[PDB]
Amino acid sequence: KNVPHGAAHIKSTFNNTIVSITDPQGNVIAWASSGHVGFKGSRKSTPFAAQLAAENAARKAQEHGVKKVDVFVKGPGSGRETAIRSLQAAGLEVGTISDVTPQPHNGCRPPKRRR
RNA sequence: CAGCUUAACUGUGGGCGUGCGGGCGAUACGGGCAGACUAGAGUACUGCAGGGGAGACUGGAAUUCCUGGUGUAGCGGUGGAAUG
Numbered sequence: 514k515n516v517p518h519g520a521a522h523i524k525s526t527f528n529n530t531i532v533s534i535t536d537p538q539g540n541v542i543a544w545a546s547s548g549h550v551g552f553k554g555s556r557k558s559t560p561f562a563a564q565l566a567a568e569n570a571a572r573k574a575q576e577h578g579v580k581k582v583d584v585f586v587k588g589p590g591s592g593r594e595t596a597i598r599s600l601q602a603a604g605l606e607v608g609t610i611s612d613v614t615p616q617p618h619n620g621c622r623p624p625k626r627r628r
Numbered sequence: 629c630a631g632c633u634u635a636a637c638u639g640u641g642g643g644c645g646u647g648c649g650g651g652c653g654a655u656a657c658g659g660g661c662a663g664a665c666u667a668g669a670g671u672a673c674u675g676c677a678g679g680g681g682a683g684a685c686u687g688g689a690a691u692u693c694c695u696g697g698u699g700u701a702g703c704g705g706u707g708g709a710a711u712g
């Protein structure tokens with residue numbers, strides 16, 4: 514089909530980073546990830562896979578005909594700016610930037626400290 | 629001091645003998661007794677800040693889960709990987 518506007522969702526952890534593009538109504542057009550790009554071990558952790566998923570989702574969404582996108586990012590830093598710049602260079606221009614990160618107001622208890 | 633020749637020893641009466649008694653005469657501090665005062669203490673008049681304590685009521689973000697859409701091959705993980 515086609516869509517004149519949508520939002521690309523970004524959630525990036527230390528060891529992963531996925532990208533999914535959704536319309537405002539909540540129906541997803543397409544998604545991409547480093548794992549699908551084919552990176553295992555620490556390879557996937559790179560922002561490089563971030564830009565790869567970036568232009569991948571760009572292609573698989575612009576096939577459906579996405580024009581305007583607003584990206585939301587979350588999670589700890591793994592290349593957020595790198596991925597957004599790669600997407601911008603991919604040919605899609607964002608109208609507004611927004612970060613909504615899961616920040617629980619001291620709900621539940623995090624797992625023990627690493628050792 | 630006194631003599632056994634000096635010798636241990638004792639011949640010698642004083643002196644020593646740290647505790648306990650009543651009678652004569654003290655009152656400074658150290659108790660009880662005695663009435664009064666307040667520099668401690670305590671309440672009394674008005675203000676104060678506070679996650680002090682107990683019960684109940686209530687909001688938010690989030691994890692997880694159930695249900696339902698969009699949606700595609702992996703998601704997740706560590707120095708890496710498989711159990712998942």
Ligand SMILES: [Mg+2]
Nearest residue numbers: 527528529558
């Ligand atoms: Mg990792």
Ligand SMILES: [Mg+2]
Nearest residue numbers: 624625627705
């Ligand atoms: Mg863990």
Ligand SMILES: [Mg+2]
Nearest residue numbers: 629630631632
């Ligand atoms: Mg003599």
Ligand SMILES: [Mg+2]
Nearest residue numbers: 641642643644
């Ligand atoms: Mg004598």
Ligand SMILES: [Mg+2]
Nearest residue numbers: 644645646647
């Ligand atoms: Mg004695």
Ligand SMILES: [Mg+2]
Nearest residue numbers: 658659660661
């Ligand atoms: Mg007394």
Ligand SMILES: [Mg+2]
Nearest residue numbers: 663664665666
């Ligand atoms: Mg008086």
Ligand SMILES: [Mg+2]
Nearest residue numbers: 668669670671
């Ligand atoms: Mg007083």
Ligand SMILES: [Mg+2]
Nearest residue numbers: 675676677678
């Ligand atoms: Mg107060």
Ligand SMILES: [Mg+2]
Nearest residue numbers: 681682683684
């Ligand atoms: Mg109680």
Ligand SMILES: [Mg+2]
Nearest residue numbers: 694695696697
């Ligand atoms: Mg569902």
